[PDB]
Coordinates of N, CA and C in Angstrom, one line a residue:
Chain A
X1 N -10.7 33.2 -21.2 CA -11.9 32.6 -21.9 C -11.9 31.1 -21.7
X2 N -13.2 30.4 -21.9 CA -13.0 28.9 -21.8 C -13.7 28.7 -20.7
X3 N -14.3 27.3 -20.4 CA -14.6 26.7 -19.2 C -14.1 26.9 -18.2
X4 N -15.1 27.9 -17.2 CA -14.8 27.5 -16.0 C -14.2 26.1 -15.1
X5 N -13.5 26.2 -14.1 CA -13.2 24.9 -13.2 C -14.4 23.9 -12.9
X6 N -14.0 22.5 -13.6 CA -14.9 21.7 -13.5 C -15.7 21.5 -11.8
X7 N -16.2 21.1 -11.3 CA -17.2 21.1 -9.9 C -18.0 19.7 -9.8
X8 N -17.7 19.5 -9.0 CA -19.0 18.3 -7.9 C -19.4 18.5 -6.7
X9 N -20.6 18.8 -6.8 CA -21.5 19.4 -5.6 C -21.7 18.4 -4.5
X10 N -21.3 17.7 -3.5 CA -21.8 17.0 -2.6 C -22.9 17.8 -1.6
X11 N -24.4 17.4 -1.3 CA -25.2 17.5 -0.4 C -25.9 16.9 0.8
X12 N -25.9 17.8 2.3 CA -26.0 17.4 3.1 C -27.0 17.8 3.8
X13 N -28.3 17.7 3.7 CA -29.5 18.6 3.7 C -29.3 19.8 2.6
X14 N -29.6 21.2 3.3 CA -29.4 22.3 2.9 C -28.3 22.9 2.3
X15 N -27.2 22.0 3.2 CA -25.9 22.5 3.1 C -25.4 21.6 2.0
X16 N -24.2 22.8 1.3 CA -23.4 21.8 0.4 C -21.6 22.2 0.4
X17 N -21.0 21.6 -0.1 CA -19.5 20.9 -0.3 C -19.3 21.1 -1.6
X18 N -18.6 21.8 -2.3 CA -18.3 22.0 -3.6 C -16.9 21.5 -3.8
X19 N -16.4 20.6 -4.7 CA -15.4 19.9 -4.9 C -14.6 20.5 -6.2
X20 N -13.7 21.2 -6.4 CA -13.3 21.8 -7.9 C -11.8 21.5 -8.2
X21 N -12.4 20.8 -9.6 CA -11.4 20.2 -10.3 C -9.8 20.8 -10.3
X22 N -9.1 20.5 -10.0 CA -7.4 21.0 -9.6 C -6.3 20.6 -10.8
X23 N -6.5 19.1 -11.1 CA -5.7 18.5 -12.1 C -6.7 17.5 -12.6
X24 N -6.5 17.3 -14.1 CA -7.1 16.3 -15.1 C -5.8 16.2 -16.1
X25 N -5.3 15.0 -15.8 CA -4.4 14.2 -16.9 C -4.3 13.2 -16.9
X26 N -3.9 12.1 -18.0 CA -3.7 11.0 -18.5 C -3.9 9.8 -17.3
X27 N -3.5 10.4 -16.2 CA -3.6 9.1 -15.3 C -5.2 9.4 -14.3
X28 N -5.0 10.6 -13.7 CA -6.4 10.9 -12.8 C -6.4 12.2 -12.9
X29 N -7.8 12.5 -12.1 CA -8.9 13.9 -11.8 C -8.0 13.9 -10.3
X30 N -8.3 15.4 -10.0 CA -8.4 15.6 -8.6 C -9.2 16.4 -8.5
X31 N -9.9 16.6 -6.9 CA -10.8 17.9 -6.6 C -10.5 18.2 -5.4
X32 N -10.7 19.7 -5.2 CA -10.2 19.8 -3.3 C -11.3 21.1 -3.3
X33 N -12.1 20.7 -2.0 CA -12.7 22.1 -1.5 C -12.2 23.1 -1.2
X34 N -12.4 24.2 -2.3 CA -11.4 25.3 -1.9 C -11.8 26.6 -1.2
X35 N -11.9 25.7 0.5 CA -11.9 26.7 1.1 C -11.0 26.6 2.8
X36 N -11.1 27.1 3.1 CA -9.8 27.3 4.4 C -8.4 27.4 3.7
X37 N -7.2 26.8 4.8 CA -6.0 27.4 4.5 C -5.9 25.6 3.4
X38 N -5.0 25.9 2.3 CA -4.4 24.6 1.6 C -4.1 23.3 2.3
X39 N -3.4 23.3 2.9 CA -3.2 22.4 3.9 C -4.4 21.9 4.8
X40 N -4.6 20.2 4.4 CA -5.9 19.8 5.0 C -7.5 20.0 4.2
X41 N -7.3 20.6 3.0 CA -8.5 20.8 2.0 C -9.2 19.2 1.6
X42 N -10.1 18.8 1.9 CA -11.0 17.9 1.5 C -10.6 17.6 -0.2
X43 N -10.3 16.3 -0.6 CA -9.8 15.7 -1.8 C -10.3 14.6 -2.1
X44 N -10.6 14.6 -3.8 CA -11.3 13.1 -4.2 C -10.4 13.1 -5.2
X45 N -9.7 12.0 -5.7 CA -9.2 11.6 -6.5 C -10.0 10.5 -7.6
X46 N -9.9 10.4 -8.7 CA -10.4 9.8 -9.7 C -9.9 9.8 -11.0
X47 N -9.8 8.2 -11.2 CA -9.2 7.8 -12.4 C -10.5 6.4 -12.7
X48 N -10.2 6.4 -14.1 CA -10.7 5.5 -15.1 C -10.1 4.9 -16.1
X49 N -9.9 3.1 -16.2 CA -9.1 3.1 -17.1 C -9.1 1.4 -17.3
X50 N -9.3 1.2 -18.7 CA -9.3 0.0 -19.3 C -8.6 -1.3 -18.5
X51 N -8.9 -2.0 -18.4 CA -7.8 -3.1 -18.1 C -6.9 -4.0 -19.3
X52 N -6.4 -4.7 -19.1 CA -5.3 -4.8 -20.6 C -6.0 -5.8 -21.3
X53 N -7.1 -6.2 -21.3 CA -7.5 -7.2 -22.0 C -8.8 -6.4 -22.9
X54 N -9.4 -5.4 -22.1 CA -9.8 -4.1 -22.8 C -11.6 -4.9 -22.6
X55 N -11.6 -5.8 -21.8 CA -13.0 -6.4 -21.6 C -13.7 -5.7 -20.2
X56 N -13.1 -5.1 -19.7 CA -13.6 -4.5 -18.1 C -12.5 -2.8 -17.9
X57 N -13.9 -2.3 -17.4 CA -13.3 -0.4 -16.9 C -13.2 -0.9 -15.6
X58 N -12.2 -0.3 -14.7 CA -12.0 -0.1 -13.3 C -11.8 1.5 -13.4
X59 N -13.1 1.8 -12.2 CA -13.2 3.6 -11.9 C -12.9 3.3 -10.0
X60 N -11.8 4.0 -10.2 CA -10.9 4.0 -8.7 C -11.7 5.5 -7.9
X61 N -12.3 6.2 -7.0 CA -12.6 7.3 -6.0 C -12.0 7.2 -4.6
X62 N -11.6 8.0 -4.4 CA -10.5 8.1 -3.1 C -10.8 9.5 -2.3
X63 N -11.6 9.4 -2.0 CA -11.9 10.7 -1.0 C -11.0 10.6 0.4
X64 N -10.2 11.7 0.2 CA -8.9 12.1 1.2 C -9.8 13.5 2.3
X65 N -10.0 12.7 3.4 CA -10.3 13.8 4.6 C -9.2 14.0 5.4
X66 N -8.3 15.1 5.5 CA -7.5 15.3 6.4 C -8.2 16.5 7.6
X67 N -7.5 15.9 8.7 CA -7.8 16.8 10.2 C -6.8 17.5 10.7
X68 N -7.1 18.6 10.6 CA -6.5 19.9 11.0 C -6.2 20.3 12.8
X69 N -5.5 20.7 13.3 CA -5.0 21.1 14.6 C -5.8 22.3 14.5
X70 N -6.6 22.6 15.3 CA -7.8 23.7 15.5 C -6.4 25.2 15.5
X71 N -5.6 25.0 16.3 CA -4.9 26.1 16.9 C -3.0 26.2 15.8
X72 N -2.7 27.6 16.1 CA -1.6 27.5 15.2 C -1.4 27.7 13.4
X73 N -0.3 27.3 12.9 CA -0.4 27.4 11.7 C -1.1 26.2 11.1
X74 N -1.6 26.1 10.0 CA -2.7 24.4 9.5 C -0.9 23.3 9.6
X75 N -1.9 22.4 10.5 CA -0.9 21.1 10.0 C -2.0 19.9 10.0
X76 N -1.8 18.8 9.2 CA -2.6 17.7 9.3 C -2.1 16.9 10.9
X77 N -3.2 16.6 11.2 CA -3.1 15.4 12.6 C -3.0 13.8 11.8
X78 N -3.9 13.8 11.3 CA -4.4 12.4 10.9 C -5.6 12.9 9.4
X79 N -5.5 11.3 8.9 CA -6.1 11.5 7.3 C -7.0 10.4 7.6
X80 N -8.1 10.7 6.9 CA -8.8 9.2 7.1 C -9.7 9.3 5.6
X81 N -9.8 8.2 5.0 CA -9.7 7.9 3.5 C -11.1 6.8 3.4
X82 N -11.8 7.0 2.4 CA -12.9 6.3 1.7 C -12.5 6.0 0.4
X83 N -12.0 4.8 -0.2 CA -11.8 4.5 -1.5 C -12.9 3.5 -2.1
X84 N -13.0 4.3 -3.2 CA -14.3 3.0 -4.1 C -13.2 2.3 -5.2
X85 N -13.9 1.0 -5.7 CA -13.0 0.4 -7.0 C -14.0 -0.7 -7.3
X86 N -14.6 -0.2 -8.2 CA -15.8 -0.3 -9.6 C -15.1 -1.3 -10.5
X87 N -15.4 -2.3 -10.8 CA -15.6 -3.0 -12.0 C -16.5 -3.0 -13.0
X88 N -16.3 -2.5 -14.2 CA -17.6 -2.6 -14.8 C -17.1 -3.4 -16.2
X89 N -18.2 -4.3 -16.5 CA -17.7 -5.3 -17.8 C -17.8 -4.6 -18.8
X90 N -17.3 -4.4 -19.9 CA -17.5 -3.9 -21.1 C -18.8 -4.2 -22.0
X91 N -19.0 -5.6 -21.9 CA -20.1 -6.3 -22.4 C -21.5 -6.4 -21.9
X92 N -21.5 -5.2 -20.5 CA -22.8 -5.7 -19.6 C -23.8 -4.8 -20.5
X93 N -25.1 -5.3 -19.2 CA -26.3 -4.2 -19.4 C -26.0 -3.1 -19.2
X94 N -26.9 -1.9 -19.8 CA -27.0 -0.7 -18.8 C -27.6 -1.2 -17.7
X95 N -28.9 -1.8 -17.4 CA -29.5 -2.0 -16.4 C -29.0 -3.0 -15.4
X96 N -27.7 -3.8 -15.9 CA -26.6 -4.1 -14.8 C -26.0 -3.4 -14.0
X97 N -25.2 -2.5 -15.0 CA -24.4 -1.3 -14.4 C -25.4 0.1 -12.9
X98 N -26.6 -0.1 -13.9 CA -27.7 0.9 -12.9 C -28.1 0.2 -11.4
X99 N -27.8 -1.2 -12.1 CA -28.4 -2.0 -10.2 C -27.0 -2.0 -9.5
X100 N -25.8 -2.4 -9.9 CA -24.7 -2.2 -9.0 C -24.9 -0.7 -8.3
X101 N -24.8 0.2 -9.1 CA -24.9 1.7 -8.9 C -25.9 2.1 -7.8
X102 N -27.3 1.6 -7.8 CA -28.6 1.9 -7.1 C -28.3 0.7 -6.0
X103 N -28.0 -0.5 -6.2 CA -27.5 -1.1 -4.6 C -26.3 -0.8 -4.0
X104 N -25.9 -0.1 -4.4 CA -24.5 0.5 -3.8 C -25.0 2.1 -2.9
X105 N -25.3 2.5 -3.3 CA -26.1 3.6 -2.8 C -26.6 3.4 -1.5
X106 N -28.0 2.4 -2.2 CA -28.5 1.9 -0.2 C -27.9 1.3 0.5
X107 N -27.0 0.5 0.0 CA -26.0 -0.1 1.2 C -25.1 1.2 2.1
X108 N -24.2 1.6 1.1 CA -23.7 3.0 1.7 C -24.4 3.8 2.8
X109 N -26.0 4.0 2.6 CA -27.0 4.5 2.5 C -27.1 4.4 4.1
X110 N -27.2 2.7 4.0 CA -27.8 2.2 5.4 C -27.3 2.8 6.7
X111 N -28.2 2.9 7.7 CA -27.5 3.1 9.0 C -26.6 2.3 9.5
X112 N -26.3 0.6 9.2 CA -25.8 0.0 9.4 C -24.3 0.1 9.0
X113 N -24.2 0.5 8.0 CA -23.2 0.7 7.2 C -22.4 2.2 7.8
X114 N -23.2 3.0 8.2 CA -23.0 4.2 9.2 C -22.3 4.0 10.7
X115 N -23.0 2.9 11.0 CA -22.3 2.6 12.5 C -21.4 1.7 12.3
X116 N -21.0 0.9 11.0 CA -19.7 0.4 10.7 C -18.8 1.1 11.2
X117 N -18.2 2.3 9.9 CA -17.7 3.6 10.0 C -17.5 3.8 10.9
X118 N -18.5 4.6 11.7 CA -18.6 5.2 12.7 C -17.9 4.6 14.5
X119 N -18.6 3.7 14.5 CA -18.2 2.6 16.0 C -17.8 1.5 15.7
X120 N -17.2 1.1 14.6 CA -16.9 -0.1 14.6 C -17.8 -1.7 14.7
X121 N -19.0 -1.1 14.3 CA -19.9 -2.3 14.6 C -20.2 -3.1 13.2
X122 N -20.0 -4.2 13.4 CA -20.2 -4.9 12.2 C -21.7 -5.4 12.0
X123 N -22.0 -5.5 10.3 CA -22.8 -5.5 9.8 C -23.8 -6.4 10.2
X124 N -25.1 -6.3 9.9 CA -26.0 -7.8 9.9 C -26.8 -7.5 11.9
X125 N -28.3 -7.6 11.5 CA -29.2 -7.0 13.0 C -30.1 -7.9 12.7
Chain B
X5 N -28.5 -16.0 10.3 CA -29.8 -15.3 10.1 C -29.8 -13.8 10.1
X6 N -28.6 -13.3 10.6 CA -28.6 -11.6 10.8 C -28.8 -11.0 9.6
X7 N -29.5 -9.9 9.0 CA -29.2 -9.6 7.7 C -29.1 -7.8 7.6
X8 N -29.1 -7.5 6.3 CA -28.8 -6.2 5.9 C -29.8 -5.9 4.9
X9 N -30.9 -5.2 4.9 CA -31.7 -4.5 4.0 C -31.1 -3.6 3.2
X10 N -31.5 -3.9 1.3 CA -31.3 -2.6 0.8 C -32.3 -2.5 0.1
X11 N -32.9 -0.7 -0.2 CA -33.9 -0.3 -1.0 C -33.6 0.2 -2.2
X12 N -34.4 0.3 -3.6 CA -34.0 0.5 -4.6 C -35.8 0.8 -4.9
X13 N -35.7 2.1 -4.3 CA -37.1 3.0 -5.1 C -37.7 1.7 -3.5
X14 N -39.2 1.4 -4.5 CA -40.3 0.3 -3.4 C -39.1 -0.8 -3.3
X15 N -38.5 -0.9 -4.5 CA -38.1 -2.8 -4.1 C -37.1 -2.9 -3.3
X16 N -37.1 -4.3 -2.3 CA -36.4 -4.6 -0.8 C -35.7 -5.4 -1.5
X17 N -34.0 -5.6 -1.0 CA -33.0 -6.2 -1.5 C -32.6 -6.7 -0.1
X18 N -32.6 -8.2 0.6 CA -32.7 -8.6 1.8 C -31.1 -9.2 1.7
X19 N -30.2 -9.2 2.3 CA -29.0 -10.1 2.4 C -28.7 -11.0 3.5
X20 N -28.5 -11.7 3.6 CA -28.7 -12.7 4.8 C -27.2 -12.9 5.1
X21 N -26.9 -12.9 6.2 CA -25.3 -13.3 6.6 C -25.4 -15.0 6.5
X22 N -24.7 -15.5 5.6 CA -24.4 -17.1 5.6 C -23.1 -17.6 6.1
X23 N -21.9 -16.2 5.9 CA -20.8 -17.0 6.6 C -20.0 -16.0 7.4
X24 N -19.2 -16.3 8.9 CA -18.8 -15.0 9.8 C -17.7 -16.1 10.4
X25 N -16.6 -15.0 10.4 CA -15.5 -15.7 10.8 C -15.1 -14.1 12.4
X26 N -14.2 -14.4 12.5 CA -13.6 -13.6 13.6 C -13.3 -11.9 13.5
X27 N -13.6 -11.6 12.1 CA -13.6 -10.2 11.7 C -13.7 -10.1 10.0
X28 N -14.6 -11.0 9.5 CA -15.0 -11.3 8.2 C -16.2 -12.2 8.2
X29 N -17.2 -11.5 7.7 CA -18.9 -11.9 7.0 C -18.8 -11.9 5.4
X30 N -20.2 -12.9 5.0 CA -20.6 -12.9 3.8 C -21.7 -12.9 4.0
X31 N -22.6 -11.9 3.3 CA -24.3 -12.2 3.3 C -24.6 -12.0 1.5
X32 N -25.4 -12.8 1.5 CA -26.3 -13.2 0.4 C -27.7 -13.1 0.4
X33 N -27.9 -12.8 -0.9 CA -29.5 -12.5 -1.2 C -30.0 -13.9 -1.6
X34 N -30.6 -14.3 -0.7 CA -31.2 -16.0 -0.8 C -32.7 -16.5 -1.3
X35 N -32.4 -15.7 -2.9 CA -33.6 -15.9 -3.8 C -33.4 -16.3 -5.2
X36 N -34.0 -16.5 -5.9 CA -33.6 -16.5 -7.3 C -32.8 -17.8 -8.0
X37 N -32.5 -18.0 -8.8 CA -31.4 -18.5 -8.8 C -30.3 -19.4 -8.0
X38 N -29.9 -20.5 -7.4 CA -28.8 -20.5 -6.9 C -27.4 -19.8 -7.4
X39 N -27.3 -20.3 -8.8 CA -26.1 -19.5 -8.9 C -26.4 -18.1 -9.1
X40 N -25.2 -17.5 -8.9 CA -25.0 -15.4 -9.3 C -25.4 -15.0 -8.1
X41 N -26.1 -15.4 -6.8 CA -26.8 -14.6 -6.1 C -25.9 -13.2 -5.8
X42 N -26.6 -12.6 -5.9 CA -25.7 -11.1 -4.7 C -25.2 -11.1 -3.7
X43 N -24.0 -10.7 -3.7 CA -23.3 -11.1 -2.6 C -22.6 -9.9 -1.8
X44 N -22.7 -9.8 -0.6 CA -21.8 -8.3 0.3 C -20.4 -9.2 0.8
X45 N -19.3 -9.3 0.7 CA -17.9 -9.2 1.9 C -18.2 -8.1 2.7
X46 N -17.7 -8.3 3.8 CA -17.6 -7.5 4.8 C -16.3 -8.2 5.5
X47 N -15.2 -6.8 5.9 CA -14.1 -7.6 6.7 C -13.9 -6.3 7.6
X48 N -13.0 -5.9 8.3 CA -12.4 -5.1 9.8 C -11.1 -6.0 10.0
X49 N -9.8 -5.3 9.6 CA -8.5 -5.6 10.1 C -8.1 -4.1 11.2
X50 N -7.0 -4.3 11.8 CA -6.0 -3.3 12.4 C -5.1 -3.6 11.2
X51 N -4.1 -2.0 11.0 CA -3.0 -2.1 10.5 C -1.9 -2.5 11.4
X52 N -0.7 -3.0 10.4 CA 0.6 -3.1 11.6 C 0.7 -2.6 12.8
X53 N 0.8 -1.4 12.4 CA 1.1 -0.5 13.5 C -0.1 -0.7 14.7
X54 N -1.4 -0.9 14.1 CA -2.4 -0.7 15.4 C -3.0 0.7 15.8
X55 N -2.8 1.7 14.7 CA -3.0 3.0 14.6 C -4.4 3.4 13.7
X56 N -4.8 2.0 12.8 CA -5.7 2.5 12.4 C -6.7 1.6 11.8
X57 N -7.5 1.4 11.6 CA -8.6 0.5 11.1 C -9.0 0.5 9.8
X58 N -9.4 -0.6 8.9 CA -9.5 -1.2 7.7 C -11.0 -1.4 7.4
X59 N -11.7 -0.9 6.9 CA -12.7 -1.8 6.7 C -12.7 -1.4 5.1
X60 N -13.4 -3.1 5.2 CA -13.6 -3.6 3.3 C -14.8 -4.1 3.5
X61 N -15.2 -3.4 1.9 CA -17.0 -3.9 2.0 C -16.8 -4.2 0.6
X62 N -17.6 -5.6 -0.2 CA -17.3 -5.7 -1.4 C -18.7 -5.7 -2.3
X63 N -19.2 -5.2 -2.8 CA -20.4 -6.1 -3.2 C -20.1 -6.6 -4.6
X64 N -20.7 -7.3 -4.5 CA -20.5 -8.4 -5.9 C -22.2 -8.6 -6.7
X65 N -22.5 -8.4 -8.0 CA -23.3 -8.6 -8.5 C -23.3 -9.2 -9.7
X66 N -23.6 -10.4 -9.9 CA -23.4 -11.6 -11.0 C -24.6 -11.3 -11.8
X67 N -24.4 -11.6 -13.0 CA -25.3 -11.4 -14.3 C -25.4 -13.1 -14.7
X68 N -26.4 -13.4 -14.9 CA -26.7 -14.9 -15.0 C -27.7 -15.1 -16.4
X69 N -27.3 -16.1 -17.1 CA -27.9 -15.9 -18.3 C -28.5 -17.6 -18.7
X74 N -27.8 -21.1 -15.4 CA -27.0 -21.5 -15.2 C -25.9 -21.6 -15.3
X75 N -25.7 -20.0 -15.6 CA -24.4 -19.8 -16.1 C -24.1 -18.4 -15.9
X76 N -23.0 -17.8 -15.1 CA -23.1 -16.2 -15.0 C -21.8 -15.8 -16.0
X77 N -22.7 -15.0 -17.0 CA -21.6 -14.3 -18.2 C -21.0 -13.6 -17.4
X78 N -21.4 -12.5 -16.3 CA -20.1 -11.6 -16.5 C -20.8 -11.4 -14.7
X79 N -19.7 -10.5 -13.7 CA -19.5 -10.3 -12.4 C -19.5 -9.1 -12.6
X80 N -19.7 -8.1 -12.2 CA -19.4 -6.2 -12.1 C -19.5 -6.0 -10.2
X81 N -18.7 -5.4 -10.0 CA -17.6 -5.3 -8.1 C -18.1 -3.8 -8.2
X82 N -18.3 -3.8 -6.7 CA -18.3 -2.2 -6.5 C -17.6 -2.3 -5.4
X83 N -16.5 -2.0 -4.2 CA -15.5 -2.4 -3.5 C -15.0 -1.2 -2.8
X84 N -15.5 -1.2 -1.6 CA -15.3 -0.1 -0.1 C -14.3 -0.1 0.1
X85 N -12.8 0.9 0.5 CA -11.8 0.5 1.3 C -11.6 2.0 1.8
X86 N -12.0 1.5 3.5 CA -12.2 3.1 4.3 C -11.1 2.6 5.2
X87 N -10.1 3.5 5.5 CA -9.1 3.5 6.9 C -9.5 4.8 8.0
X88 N -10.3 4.2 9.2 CA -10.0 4.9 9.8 C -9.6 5.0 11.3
X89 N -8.6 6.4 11.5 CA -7.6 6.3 12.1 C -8.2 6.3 13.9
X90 N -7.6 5.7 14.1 CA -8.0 5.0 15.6 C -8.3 6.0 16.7
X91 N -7.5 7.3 16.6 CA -7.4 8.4 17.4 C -8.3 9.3 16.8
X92 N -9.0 9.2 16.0 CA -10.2 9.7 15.3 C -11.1 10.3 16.2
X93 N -11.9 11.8 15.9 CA -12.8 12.2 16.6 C -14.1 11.4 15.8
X94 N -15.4 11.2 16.5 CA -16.4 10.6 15.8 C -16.9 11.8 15.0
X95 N -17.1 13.1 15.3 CA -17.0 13.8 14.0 C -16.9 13.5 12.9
X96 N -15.3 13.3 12.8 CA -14.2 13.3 11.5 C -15.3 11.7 11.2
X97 N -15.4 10.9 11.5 CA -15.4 9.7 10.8 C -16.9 9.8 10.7
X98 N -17.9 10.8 11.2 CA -19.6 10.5 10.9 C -19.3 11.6 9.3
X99 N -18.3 12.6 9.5 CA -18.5 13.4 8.5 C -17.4 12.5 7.2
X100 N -16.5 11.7 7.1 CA -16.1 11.1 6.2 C -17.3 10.0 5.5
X101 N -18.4 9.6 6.6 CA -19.4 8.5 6.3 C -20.3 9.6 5.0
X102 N -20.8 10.8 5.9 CA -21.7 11.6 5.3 C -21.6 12.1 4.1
X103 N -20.2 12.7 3.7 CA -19.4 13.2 2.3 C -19.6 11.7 1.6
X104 N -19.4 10.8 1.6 CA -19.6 9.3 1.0 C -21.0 9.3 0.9
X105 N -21.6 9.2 1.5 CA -23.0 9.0 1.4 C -23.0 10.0 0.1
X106 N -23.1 11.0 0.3 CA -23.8 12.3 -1.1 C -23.1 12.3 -2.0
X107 N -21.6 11.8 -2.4 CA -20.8 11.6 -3.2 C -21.4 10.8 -3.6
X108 N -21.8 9.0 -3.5 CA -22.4 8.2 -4.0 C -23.8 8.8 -4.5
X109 N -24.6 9.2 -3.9 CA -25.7 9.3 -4.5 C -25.8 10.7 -5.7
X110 N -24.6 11.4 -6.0 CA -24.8 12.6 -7.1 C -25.0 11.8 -8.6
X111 N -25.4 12.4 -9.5 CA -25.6 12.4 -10.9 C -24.6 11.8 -11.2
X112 N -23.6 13.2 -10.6 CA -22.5 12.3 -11.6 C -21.7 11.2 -11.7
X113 N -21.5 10.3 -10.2 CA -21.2 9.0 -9.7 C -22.1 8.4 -10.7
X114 N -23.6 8.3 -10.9 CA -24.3 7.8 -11.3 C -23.4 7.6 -13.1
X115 N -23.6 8.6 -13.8 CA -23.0 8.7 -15.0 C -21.5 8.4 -15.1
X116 N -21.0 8.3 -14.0 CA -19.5 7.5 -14.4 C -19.4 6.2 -14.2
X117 N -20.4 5.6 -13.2 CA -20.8 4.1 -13.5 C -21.5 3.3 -14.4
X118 N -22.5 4.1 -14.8 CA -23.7 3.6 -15.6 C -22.6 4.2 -17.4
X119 N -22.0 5.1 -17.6 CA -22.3 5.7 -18.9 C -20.5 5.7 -19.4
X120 N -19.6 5.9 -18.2 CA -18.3 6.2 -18.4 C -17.4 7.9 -18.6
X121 N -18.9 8.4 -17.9 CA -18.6 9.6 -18.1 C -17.8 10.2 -16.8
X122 N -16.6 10.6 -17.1 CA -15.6 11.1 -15.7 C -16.4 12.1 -14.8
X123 N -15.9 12.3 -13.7 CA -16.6 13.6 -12.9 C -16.5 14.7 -13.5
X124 N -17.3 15.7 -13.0 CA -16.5 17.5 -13.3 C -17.7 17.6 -14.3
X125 N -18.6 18.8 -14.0 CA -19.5 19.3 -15.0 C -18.8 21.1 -14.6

C-alpha cells in the first residue's frame, strides 16, 4: 500500500523518458530510467537546501547520461553530465523567480545553445 | 555586436555580447536601467587531461529597486566527453531541453517544491 514511485516525465515530441524516483533522503532525490540493463540507466540527481545564513535556496540537477558499448555485457564507455545550480533569494518575487525560470528555458531552448553542446560553437550570431 | 535572442511567450529578450576573451563572453541586455541589467557568462575550458570539454553558462538576473536588492543565478555546467558520438551529446542537449521546460522544474524554482509527482 502507499504511493507508488515518484516519476518525471521528460518530452521529446511524441516520445517520452520516464525518470522514477530511486532514493529520497536528507541530502538528495535520485531518478534513473528504468529501462535496459542497470548499468548505464539515464540519472538526475537533485537536492535542495538552505544556505547557512538561511537568506537564499540553492537547487543543484545533475543529469548523468552514461554510454553504453553496443556489444557484450553493459559497461559504461564515457558519461557526459548537465548540471544546473539555482540560486533563489528567499526574499524575492514570485515573478522574479518565474523570469529566471522562463529565461532559462529559452536560452536552453535556443539553437544556439544547441550547437554549443553539440559542436562546440560559441554563443552570439 | 553579436547577440543571443530569448523569447518569453511574444516578449524578445535581446543580449548583446559586450565582452570575449579567448574562450569566455559576456552578453547583456542593453536596456533599462544601467544597473541590474541581465547578464549570460559564457566560458569553454578542456580538462587536464584533454579528454573532455567544460562548458559554463551563467545567467544572472538582478532585481533593482539604483540599487539591486537581491541577484537570483541559474548556472549550466555540461562536461562533454571529447570522444563523444554527436548522438550522445544532441541527446544530452534534448533530455535538458524537456527537463527544463516540465512543470515540475518550473515548481521547484518558482514554489520550492522538490521533483517526483
Amino acid at each position: 500500500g502507499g504511493s507508488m514511485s515518484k516519476t518525471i516525465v521528460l518530452s521529446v515530441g511524441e516520445a517520452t523518458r520516464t525518470l522514477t524516483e530511486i532514493q529520497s533522503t536528507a541530502d538528495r532525490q535520485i531518478f534513473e530510467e528504468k529501462v535496459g540493463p542497470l548499468v548505464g540507466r539515464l540519472r538526475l540527481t537533485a537536492s535542495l537546501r538552505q544556505n547557512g545564513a538561511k537568506t537564499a535556496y540553492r537547487v543543484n540537477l545533475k543529469l548523468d547520461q552514461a554510454d553504453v558499448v553496443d556489444s557484450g555485457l553493459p559497461k559504461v564507455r564515457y558519461t557526459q553530465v548537465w548540471s544546473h545550480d539555482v540560486t533563489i533569494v528567499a526574499n524575492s518575487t514570485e515573478a522574479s523567480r518565474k523570469s529566471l525560470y522562463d529565461l532559462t528555458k529559452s536560452l536552453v531552448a535556443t539553437s544556439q545553445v544547441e550547437d554549443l553542446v553539440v559542436n562546440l560553437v560559441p554563443l552570439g550570431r
